[PDB]
Amino acid sequence: AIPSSLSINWNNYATGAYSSGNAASDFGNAGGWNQSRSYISDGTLRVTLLKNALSGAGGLISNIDVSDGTEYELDYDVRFHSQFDWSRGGAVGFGFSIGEGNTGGDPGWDGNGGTLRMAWYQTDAGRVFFQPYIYHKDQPGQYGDTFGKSYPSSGSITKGTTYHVHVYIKSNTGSNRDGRAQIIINGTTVLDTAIRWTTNDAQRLIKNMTFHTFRGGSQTYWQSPVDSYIYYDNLVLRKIR
Ligand SMILES: O=C(O)[C@H]1O[C@@H](O[C@H]2[C@H](O)[C@H](O)[C@H](O[C@H]3[C@H](O)[C@H](O)[C@H](O)O[C@@H]3C(=O)O)O[C@@H]2C(=O)O)[C@@H](O)[C@@H](O)[C@@H]1O
Ligand SMILES: [Ca+2]
Numbered sequence: 001a002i003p004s005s006l007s008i009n010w011n012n013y014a015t016g017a018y019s020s021g022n023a024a025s026d027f028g029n030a031g032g033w034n035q036s037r038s039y040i041s042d043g044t045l046r047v048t049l050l051k052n053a054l055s056g057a058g059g060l061i062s063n064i065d066v067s068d069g070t071e072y073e074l075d076y077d078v079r080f081h082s083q084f085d086w087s088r089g090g091a092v093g094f095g096f097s098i099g100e101g102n103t104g105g106d107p108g109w110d111g112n113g114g115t116l117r118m119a120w121y122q123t124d125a126g127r128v129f130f131q132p133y134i135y136h137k138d139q140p141g142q143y144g145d146t147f148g149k150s151y152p153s154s155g156s157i158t159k160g161t162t163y164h165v166h167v168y169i170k171s172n173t174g175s176n177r178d179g180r181a182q183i184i185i186n187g188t189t190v191l192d193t194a195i196r197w198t199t200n201d202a203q204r205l206i207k208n209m210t211f212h213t214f215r216g217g218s219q220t221y222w223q224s225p226v227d228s229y230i231y232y233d234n235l236v237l238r239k240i241r
Helices: 020-027
Strands: 005-008 039-041 044-049 060-069 071-080 089-099 113-122 128-135 163-170 180-185 188-193 206-215 228-239
Touching: 005 020, 044 206, 060 071, 060 228, 071 089, 071 206, 089 128, 089 163, 089 228, 113 163, 113 180, 113 206, 128 180, 128 188, 206 228
Parallel strands: none
Antiparallel strands: 005 228, 039 044, 044 228, 060 206, 071 163, 071 228, 089 113, 089 206, 113 128, 163 180, 180 188
């Protein structure tokens, strides 16, 4: 399966290990999955973020290939551990890839793709929030563009609190800015902006659904000395057009 729609809630599972074959079962395919980092706590998907490590070394980075399209949406629930250590931040939740799915320090300035993902950050003063993490044709930096948005707008997200993310993406056409990146958290729009993902109409299309959970960042201070847990539930992916 290279699906076009998925409805996972993990209720059919015993509290215990979650397999990469379990992953491919519920997902149709699961690229770089690491079952040492998955587990099924009380009917929720628990990814683990291990101590003293960053990025893929410490987290889970799978790309679920999905039926190509031009408009896609997904909804998911996510809950940081009640005793979680925020630290500086990292990537969280389900996102979309377009064309070459530009990540890393690889900006989509060539016009050949990008991503639409979310992160959490904590400022020097300690405000903690959700933020957009985008890669597109016109992203200002080497790294992901946040459009200076944050959820909440003021104050902080809080540990153990279930947030419902709605993600929505629409391929643009040619060199026009007729694309879309939309992110709604608990009913509030964080981001709803026209965007120019790509300028090469061959990488124009949405190709797969990212599942990228990790700390960092790449500097040493994004890390954390304990192992850490993030819980997911009730994912509904759906191809639109
Ligand atoms: O303290 C900071 O805010 C610090 O962040 C640095 O930029 C980060 C950027 O925030 C982002 O976190 C990003 O995350 C990467 C990570 O590098 C790694 O590449 C992972 O493979 O991919 C993530 C992603 O796909 O982009 O990486 C940037 C990085 O610097 O690590 C800088 O802005 C730093 O100066 C700033 O003070
Ligand atoms: Ca569930």
